[PDB]
Homo-oligomer: A and B are copies of this chain.
Amino acid sequence: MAQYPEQLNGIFQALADPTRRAVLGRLSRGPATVSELAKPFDMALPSFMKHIHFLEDSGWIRTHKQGRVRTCAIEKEPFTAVEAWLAEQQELWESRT
């Protein structure tokens, strides 16, 4: 039984944005604060926060606020989900008779 579609929709939508993919690339190297993550990007912080929030809501990252500081870390589950969906299609392709 394939994963329910609603779980995958948001996971893939998160990856459709280059800012979000860049943030995930950084968090793959280890955790970071929002202010650190925002530095490469020419957008106002509210616009950047939309990306952070989307990443958290879709399960790609976890964040924690203490005072004015918000720490972020990558989550591995969505990687597993993407891998799983891909592998399923690739099994169908390689098993063609």
- Contact A89 to B5, CB < 8 A, known contacts A95-B29, A96-B30: no
- Complex Cα distance A15/B58, Å? 14
This chain's copy number in the assembly: 2
A89 to B, closest residue via Cβ: B28
- Complex Cα distance A12/B20, Å? 12
A-B contact pairs, 23 of them (CB 8 A): A5-B18, A5-B21, A6-B18, A8-B15, A8-B21, A9-B16, A9-B17, A9-B18, A12-B16, A13-B13, A15-B15, A15-B85, A16-B16, A24-B89, A25-B89, A25-B92, A28-B92, A28-B93, A30-B96, A79-B86, A79-B89, A82-B82, A83-B86
